[PDB]
Write a protein that binds this DNA or RNA. Structure first.
Ligand SMILES: [K+]
Ligand SMILES: [K+]
Ligand SMILES: [K+]
Ligand SMILES: [K+]
Ligand SMILES: [K+]
Ligand SMILES: [K+]
Ligand SMILES: [K+]
Ligand SMILES: [K+]
Ligand SMILES: [Mg+2]
Ligand SMILES: [Mg+2]
Ligand SMILES: [Mg+2]
Ligand SMILES: [Mg+2]
Ligand SMILES: [Mg+2]
Ligand SMILES: [Mg+2]
Ligand SMILES: [Mg+2]
Ligand SMILES: [Mg+2]
Ligand SMILES: [Mg+2]
Ligand SMILES: [Mg+2]
Ligand SMILES: [Mg+2]
Ligand SMILES: [Mg+2]
Ligand SMILES: [Mg+2]
Ligand SMILES: [Mg+2]
Ligand SMILES: [Mg+2]
Ligand SMILES: [Mg+2]
Lengths: 306, 65, 512, 132, 196, 125, 49, 88, 101
RNA sequence: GGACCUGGCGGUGCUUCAUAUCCCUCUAGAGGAGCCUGUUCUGUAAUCGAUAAACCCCGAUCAACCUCACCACCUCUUGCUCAGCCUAUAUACCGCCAUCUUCAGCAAACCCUGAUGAAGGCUACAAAGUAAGCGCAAGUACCCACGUAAAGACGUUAGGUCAAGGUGUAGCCCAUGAGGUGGCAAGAAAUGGGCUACAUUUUCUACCCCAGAAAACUACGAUAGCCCUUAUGAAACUUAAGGGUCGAAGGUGGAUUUAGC
């Protein structure tokens, strides 16, 4: 399916007219009718629940939907590297190799090299893996040299979240005591923890003293871990409510909630140590499903080699 | 539908038959799938059935009508 | 919600290929869809057992097979009433003799229910899914045989006999049968008196003066038997008087002045029979003009209900009288009275509807400004009615008068969508108008684009029985529209067709 | 290997439709459903009786509109109503289409005791998604 | 000769028209009626989504072209003559339980198909607090022993659920009959109530 | 039953056995290849054994300016339509059922293949 | 009820309003076996006796 | 129409079941199918019979294909006359 | 016009089980109790055993409605796994999709 | 017969390897006992099919009658069906799958090489290959980017199934069809998979994790046997549950072998 400039020019007029019709249906002003409203009106008038968002109704501008002749009537190719097959890729290697010769004559985090799939969009040319590596080798070579200001702009074209815990807002109760509330999750257990700023180290889970609620020592050890690490045991009063899961799933969920709510009463440096200790991360390990042809999630039925 | 002991006036007031027919009318009163015309059919069928087993019901000391 | 002006009637499929183009397709597309419903009912009543199963809750009695065949196969009095409700004329009359021959007493209410079915259809079977001129009242018909056999006759007996004769154009005999009714000291009903006025005038083609005296005698007998007239009684008098166009003018009004006194709201039909009587092909139409004006004011701002079958015909009659008078102020009242409430259902069948809109849109173009005339053309057409050639030609004579010759390349595209692609008279008035005078380049190049589409029509034509023929004027005009436009190259290729078909070229084409 | 509802690869001269070009594992990701009723919803009933009607309706229309069906039917139910939506070729004359609409609508309304309406959408030629 | 399809009426449509008149009631997507260049489908390599003409994916969708905001506001303006005003006195829910202490439950089910029947529509639940009834010490104590687990002490609400009879009007009359016999039997003191 | 009926495409695909293990490696003789036939080629919509004439479908909707009604062909007239249909079927089959040999009758050598296919850039041979 | 479904569409095929491609198939295979000699025998007058 | 309405979304339900992949044998190879039911509760308050009647008809008629409805109605009644005082 | 004789037999079975449903219910009620005398219960044991075998509901088999397959049938759709998948794999069963989790 | 090509094979070489895998190495098992269950033999008047990997709690998310196709006896004949067939052929097929695939290759259409032989077609500081389409991948589902599902070609094994259904061909048509009554589906033996155990990290009870008893010929240990009752059902030594009685083998298992990051 080849689309010429005249065909795309007629599609530009049908979208503009269709954009004024869709505004009359919804009762909006045609002039200030952006593309976000079109996406909202087409999702109401044509409700599709297809998981793929590329298979749903879309009424976009023809320049964002549709993805030219390389010779004139005489037949002479415009570009001088037409017969190479990759005139766009080789014109770029010819330009980069020409800037590396001038340098000889007169003489970072958050950024990544353009990926292969993104480099075939700038050139509209299919590229092999090896050719992409060759191009990257020249750009890196360019950077090592004392490149001028203009060169930095050229390289920048081909180049493309702070791991800090979110502190909870300290609140105040009717009496005036300061605390912080957070939530945790472990397997199927969900927990909410309230950590008072000043306390005598009393913890109540679901209205029951923690030692009564958690008989097994291991569970109590998990509760201590956050406070022991920040060397402030017997200084806060905790009131949590865990629901779901089992014995060991409930403690883990409380540990994470207390730890998150105890980050509001500690310094920034201490919160980073808690993060590096694995006290503020949610364990993503959950039960794996069983498969129709196997005994278990990964266990297989006995192979009758016999 | 719920008060079906008006139809047991041709049955013994006391006895096993009454205890049996007090279970039929309790189950038929808990039935939202039958009409009242169909519930009486059941009751009339037993009345005709116990009139034909009178000789068998005299051996077991039961005076049905 | 209002009507969609860009769509055809809902009954049709909303699809360009299935959309009715012309007016012939419109009527022929609904008759083929009605033929599928008759071919389905045929199959639903011939083989009911397939459709007897019922899964609907609540029960739909209108989606169940009908059972015409009678069930009671015995010979009793109750087995005959079952063949009279199923309108089995032949079976009932053949099964009555056997019952009568046996000697079983037959009620008077069951023999009067057989005459009704025989006197109505006239001893003929009703039309069935599958198995005008002259008089259909045979002399050797059951209706008269069973009438004599009867040992006792009440009022209803004659009443349902007189109405059966007039219906089958047996007027002369009904009057002879009405003299016997008078000899038996009986009293007729209103329905029997209604048919006696139709028979009286129709029986003999005498002068109106004699007929007027005759009709007055029945009405005086109607008041001597404590009989109250209804709407239909007056409606027949007006319908009957239609023949005496001039003379009846004043008398017909008298009938309308007696309907008000005795409290009989005239319906659409009562007025439809007056205008037709008054309406005549006369140039002055002085009397007709006043009549319609008064009638419309009385009817103005009213909602109508069906009372007589002729009510539908009124709207067609009024518009016709308005186009003859060339009055557009009176056509906006008639069409404004058709929109109130649900009066839009009295317009009539497709034939009546197209005639009404045609005469209507033809008086709008001629008489009103060309800016509104193009608003009525976008609303009505095609949602209301498909136009006939004379309406597109009537519209072209309005643009010419309104110096708006830039819409002709739009009137020709529509014509092709309404079935006038190959209308000689249409293409012969579009080309001449475009080529009549020189126009600026931008407008002169558009007319050439219509002459290149009108020229293709001549080259390819639906009827191949006769050799392709090009009118002298068309070829004369298509060539001069190319020159002025600038398509000289193609202007020289048409020269051969002038002599090929012996078509004389005009001097204005050679000079240029 | 899996075979269900898959059109095997060919030289390239075989034209397939969007629905015919997608396998069963795309039925809710890239495809919808050809029938839409409530029978299969949680707590709904009469799923086996709406199914038998669909199997018969697709065969009734395939044999009643022979050679005219470009794509599969889209059956829609709203209360008592049943809406049949079809894509058809333009080869057949319109006169014959209107006959088949009034015959099928009426016959199927007396057979399933429900108002049935049929909505045709003619297409010049069978829309082709790609050539397998 | 071979019939030729007409151009779509979309071209005739104006930008400032009345859409409700085009799509007054529910109908399938008609590309010849919808004046929008809307596409659907999963694109092939270096391809675009399928067009609306002949698209079976846009016909499966249950569209809301008949329920545009302009219409709803236009429809409901004509439906304000059918509605009645709610008594202003009944501000909150605490005031509704003072004049109307009884709450009746009834459910209607809407499913597609030819039959509208549903056995779940016969169930009727009646809720009523015991504080709104003229009961004394003895009556209230006896009434809680007859109903068993139908009374919740936490909320002091008696719930009566009746599904015995086919119709919902019979189960409502039976629930009101049960409330009367329990009220008139709670006030009646027997001679066997002294052995408590 | 009526629910155990397939379509023509499915019936021929299984009858021809074009795609099978036998075809793959010279395991099937070509002496009597099965041949697909279209059973809808000469069928008119609305024509059945009973001979019913459906207005608007089988026959013209309107005759002599008036709409026709449901009619059924007579036995004599319907017997002539079934026999005339057979003749068309035989004629169509007969036409489907001369060659110039080369060096030998079964030899390919010496046979003409015609001129080569024309080139895209206005080249012909 | 397979009878109703199988009897309705048998009647509709004889009336010409339903085209069964499956019967056509097996109407042609049974027509090509009469020409090949493989015709069903008369009842009673079978190969065995 | 002037009706108070609150909207929430109850947790969805997913019914799954397994079937044999092949017509014959090959028990270890099966196929799994599911039906997804999604809910949406519209809790209106302080209506009247007439107001609920037209509103329910309006939304019920426009209910799209594949969408069921369960309308639970809580009616306000008054104590019956007999319940007012005991029959001494 | 049923798939096979096996299906036809069940159709009769289901028709004869609907006619004697009430008669069998009334007779079993006598048997299913400890109230009535054994003499009467022994007479009812002979009356319900003399009725046709096809009236017994334990002889009814839930076969497929298209292929009359006795096993591998889904009760909600009354279809075999093979016929169910065919319609489900073609997107003809509203709501039915393949499960992945 | 000589000399080549391809493919397969090799108790053929070399090198990189398998990341729950080839071997060693970690953990729980199997094989030993009893029971359950399938198969094979044998047996019976008394089905069929799968049957190295890729059969063996497989078709069956299921057989007291029914299901049922089997056997014996009796019966019917245009027969529920504009008949019918669970009759043969899966080596005629569709259809749905297995398998290599815990892969990436498959391939139209061109081009070139080899003197225009079958055949073959890479080297990135590049030497003849380009490639739609298919699969992979990407997307999607589920709790994300992870992982698990799903997907997974073209071919291979004339792999599996005519007994899902349909169907080509050959065959039966007072019978190879249809219906009824009764009935068998066992166990000398061998084998596969599984359950429970041989106990003290255990047994019983209370609790649901701070306890008290038990503890080798009245211990651990049968879901078996025998007897009764109950449930379902028209029908139960018969199916299932429970109780009672009973208290066996077995004392942690050879060569070999399975699964799992
Ligand atoms: K080799
Ligand atoms: K063992
Ligand atoms: K096969
Ligand atoms: K088979
Ligand atoms: K066969
Ligand atoms: K074992
Ligand atoms: K134990
Ligand atoms: K072991
Ligand atoms: Mg395990
Ligand atoms: Mg020869
Ligand atoms: Mg597999
Ligand atoms: Mg028993
Ligand atoms: Mg059973
Ligand atoms: Mg065996
Ligand atoms: Mg048996
Ligand atoms: Mg095979
Ligand atoms: Mg084999
Ligand atoms: Mg993944
Ligand atoms: Mg898998
Ligand atoms: Mg994949
Ligand atoms: Mg047999
Ligand atoms: Mg038997
Ligand atoms: Mg035991
Ligand atoms: Mg023991």
């Amino acid at each position: 399916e080849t689309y010429t400039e005249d065909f795309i020019k007629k599609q530009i007029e049908e979208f503009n007219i269709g954009k004024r019709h869709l505004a009359n249906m919804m009762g909006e002003d045609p002039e200030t009718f952006t593309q976000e409203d079109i996406d909202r009106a087409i999702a109401y008038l044509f409700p599709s629940g297809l998981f793929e968002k590329r298979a749903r109704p879309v009424m976009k501008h023809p320049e964002q939907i549709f993805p030219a002749i390389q010779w004139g009537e005489d037949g002479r190719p415009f570009h001088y590297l037409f017969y190479t097959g990759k005139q766009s890729y080789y014109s770029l290697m010819h330009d980069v190799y020409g800037m590396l010769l001038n340098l000889e004559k007169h003489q970072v985090i958050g950024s990544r090299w353009l990926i292969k799939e993104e480099l075939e969009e700038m050139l509209v040319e299919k590229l092999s893996d090896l050719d992409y590596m060759q191009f990257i080798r020249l750009l890196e070579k360019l950077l090592t040299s004392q490149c001028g200001a203009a060169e930095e702009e050229f390289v920048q074209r081909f180049r493309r979240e702070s791991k800090k815990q979110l502190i909870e807002p300290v609140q105040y109760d009717e009496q005036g005591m300061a605390f912080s509330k957070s939530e945790g999750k472990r397997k199927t257990a969900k927990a909410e923890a309230i950590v008072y700023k000043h306390g005598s180290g009393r913890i109540k889970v679901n209205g029951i003293d923690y030692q009564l609620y958690f008989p097994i020592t291991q569970d109590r050890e998990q509760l201590m871990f956050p406070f022991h690490f920040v060397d402030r045991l017997g200084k806060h009063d905790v009131t949590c409510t865990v629901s779901g899961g089992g014995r060991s799933a409930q403690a883990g969920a409380i540990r994470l909630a207390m730890a998150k709510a105890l980050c509001s009463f500690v310094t920034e440096d201490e919160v980073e140590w808690m993060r590096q200790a694995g006290l503020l991360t949610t364990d993503p390990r959950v039960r794996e499903r069983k498969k129709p042809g196997q005994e278990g999630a990964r266990r297989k039925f006995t192979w009758k080699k016999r | 539908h719920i008060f079906l002991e008006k139809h047991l006036e041709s049955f013994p007031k006391q006895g096993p038959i009454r205890h049996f027919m007090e279970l039929v009318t309790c189950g038929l009163s808990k039935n939202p799938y039958l009409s009242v015309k169909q519930k009486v059919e059941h009751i009339e069928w037993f009345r005709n059935y116990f009139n034909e087993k009178k000789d068998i019901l005299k051996e077991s000391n039961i005076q049905f009508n | 919600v209002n009507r969609d002006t860009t769509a055809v009637p809902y009954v049709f499929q909303d699809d360009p290929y299935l959309m009715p183009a012309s007016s012939l397709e419109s009527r022929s597309f609904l008759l083929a869809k009605k033929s599928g419903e008759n071919v389905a009912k045929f199959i639903i009543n011939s083989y009911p057992k397939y459709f007897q199963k019922d899964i609907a809750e609540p029960h739909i009695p209108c989606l169940m097979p009908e059972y015409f065949e009678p069930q009671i196969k015995d010979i009793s009095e109750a087995a005959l009433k079952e063949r009279i409700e199923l309108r089995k004329v032949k079976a009932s009359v053949d099964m009555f003799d056997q019952l009568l021959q046996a000697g079983t007493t037959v009620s008077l209410e069951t023999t009067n229910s057989l005459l009704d079915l025989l006197c109505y259809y006239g001893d003929q079977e009703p039309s069935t899914d599958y198995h005008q001129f002259g008089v259909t009242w045979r002399a050797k018909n059951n209706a008269e045989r069973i009438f004599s056999l009867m040992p006792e006759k009440n009022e209803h007996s004659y009443c349902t006999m007189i109405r059966g004769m007039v219906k089958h154009r047996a007027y002369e005999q009904a009057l002879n049968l009405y003299t016997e009714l008078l000899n038996n000291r009986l009293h007729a009903d209103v329905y029997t008196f209604n048919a006696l006025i139709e028979a009286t005038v129709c029986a003999i083609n005498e002068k109106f003066e004699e007929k007027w005296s005759k009709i007055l005698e029945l009405l005086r007998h109607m008041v001597a038997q404590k009989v109250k007239p209804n709407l239909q009684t007056f409606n027949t008098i007006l319908k009957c008087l239609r023949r005496f166009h001039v003379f009846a003018r004043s008398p017909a009004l008298q009938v309308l002045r007696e309907m008000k006194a005795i409290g009989i709201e005239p319906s659409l039909a009562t007025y439809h029979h007056i205008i037709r009587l008054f309406d005549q092909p006369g140039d002055p139409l002085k009397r007709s003009s006043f009549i319609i004006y008064d009638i419309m004011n009385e009817l103005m701002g009213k909602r109508f209900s069906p009372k007589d079958p002729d009510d539908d015909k009124f709207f067609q009659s009024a518009m016709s009288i308005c186009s003859s008078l060339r009055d557009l102020e009176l056509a906006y009242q008639v069409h404004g009275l058709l929109k109130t409430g649900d009066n839009w259902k009295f317009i009539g069948p497709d034939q009546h509807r197209n005639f009404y809109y045609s005469k209507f849109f033809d008086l709008i173009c001629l008489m009103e400004q060309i800016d509104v005339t193009l608003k009525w053309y976008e609303d009505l057409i095609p949602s209301a009615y498909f136009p006939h050639s004379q309406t597109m030609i009537h519209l072209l004579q309005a643009l010419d008068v309104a110096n708006r010759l830039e819409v002709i390349p739009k009137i020709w595209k529509d014509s092709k969508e309404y079935g006038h692609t190959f209308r000689s008279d249409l293409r012969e008035e579009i080309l001449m108008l475009m080529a009549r005078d020189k126009h600026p380049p931008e407008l002169q190049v558009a007319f050439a684009d219509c002459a290149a589409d009108i020229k293709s029509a001549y080259e390819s034509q639906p009827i191949r029985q006769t050799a392709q023929d090009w009118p002298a004027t068309s070829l004369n005009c298509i060539a001069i529209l190319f020159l002025r436009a600038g398509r000289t190259q193609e202007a020289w290729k048409m020269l051969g067709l002038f002599r090929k078909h012996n078509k004389i070229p005009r001097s204005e084409l050679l000079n240029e | 290997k899996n075979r269900a509802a898959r059109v095997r690869v060919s030289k390239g001269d075989k034209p397939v439709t969007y629905e015919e070009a997608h396998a069963p594992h795309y039925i809710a990701h890239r495809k919808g459903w050809l029938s839409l009723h409530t029978g299969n919803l949680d707590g709904e009933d009469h799923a086996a009786e709406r199914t038998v009607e669909d199997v018969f309706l697709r065969k009734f229309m395939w044999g009643t509109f022979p050679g005219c069906l470009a794509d599969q039917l889209v059956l829609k139910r709203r209360g008592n109503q049943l809406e049949i939506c079809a894509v058809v070729l333009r080869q057949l004359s319109p006169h014959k289409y209107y006959f088949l609409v009034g015959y099928s609508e009426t016959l199927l309304s007396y057979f399933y005791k429900c108002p049935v309406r049929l909505h045709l959408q003619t297409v010049p030629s069978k829309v082709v998604y790609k050539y397998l | 000769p071979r019939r030729k399809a007409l151009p779509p009426r979309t071209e005739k449509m104006a930008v400032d028209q009345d859409w409700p008149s085009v799509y007054p009631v529910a109908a399938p997507f008609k590309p010849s009626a919808v004046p929008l260049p809307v596409r659907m489908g999963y694109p092939v390599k270096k391809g675009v989504p399928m067009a609306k003409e002949g698209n079976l994916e846009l016909l499966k969708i249950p569209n809301f072209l008949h329920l545009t905001p302009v219409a709803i506001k236009k429809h409901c303006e004509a439906l304000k003559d059918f509605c009645t005003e709610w008594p202003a006195a009944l501000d909150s829910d605490e005031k509704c339980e003072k004049h109307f202490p009884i709450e009746i439950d009834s459910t209607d089910y809407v499913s597609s198909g030819p039959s509208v029947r549903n056995p779940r529509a016969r169930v009727v639940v009646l809720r009523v607090k015991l504080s709104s009834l003229n009961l004394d010490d003895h009556a209230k104590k006896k009434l809680i022993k007859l109903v068993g687990e139908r009374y919740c002490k936490t909320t002091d609400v008696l719930t009566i659920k009746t599904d015995r009879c086919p119709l919902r009007r019979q189960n409502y009359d039976y629930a009101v009959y049960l409330l009367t016999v329990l009220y008139h039997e709670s006030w009646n003191t027997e001679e066997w109530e002294k052995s408590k | 039953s009526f629910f155990t009926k397939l379509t023509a495409d499915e019936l021929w695909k299984g009858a021809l056995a074009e795609t099978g293990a036998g075809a793959k490696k010279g395991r099937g003789k070509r002496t009597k290849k099965k041949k697909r036939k279209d059973l809808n080629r000469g069928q008119i919509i609305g024509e059945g054994r009973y001979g019913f004439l459906w207005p608007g479908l089988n026959v013209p909707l309107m005759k002599n300016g008036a709409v026709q009604t449901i009619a059924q062909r007579s036995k004599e007239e319907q017997e002539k339509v079934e026999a005339d249909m057979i003749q068309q079927r035989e004629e169509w089959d007969r036409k489907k059922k001369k060659r110039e040999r080369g060096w030998s009758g079964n030899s390919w050598g010496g046979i003409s293949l015609g001129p080569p296919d024309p080139g895209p850039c206005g080249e012909t041979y | 009820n397979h009878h109703t479904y199988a009897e309705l569409m048998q009647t509709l095929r004889f009336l010409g309003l339903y085209r069964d491609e499956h019967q056509d198939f097996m109407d042609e295979q049974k027509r090509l076996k009469k020409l090949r000699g493989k015709e069903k025998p008369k009842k009673g007058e079978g190969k065995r006796a | 129409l002037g009706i108070s309405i609150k909207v929430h979304e109850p947790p969805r339900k997913i019914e799954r079941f397994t079937l044999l992949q092949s017509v014959h044998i090959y028990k270890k190879h099966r196929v799994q199918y599911e039906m997804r039911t999604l809910y949406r509760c519209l809790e209106l308050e302080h209506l009247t019979g007439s107001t609920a009647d037209v509103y329910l008809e309006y939304i019920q008629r426009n209910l799209p294909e594949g969408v069921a409805m369960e309308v639970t109605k809580t009616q306000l009644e008054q104590l019956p006359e007999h319940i007012k005082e005991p029959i001494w | 016009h049923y798939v096979d004789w096996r299906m036809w037999r069940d159709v009769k079975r289901r028709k004869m089980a609907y006619e004697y449903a009430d008669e069998r219910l009334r007779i079993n009620s006598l048997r299913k109790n400890t109230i009535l005398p054994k003499i009467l219960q022994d007479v009812a044991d002979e009356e319900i055993a003399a009725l046709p075998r096809d009236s017994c509901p334990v002889r009814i088999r839930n076969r497929c409605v298209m292929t009359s397959r006795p096993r591998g049938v889904k009760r909600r759709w009354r279809l075999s796994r093979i016929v169910f998948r065919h319609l489900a794999d073609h997107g003809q069963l509203s709501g039915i999709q393949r499960a992945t989790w």
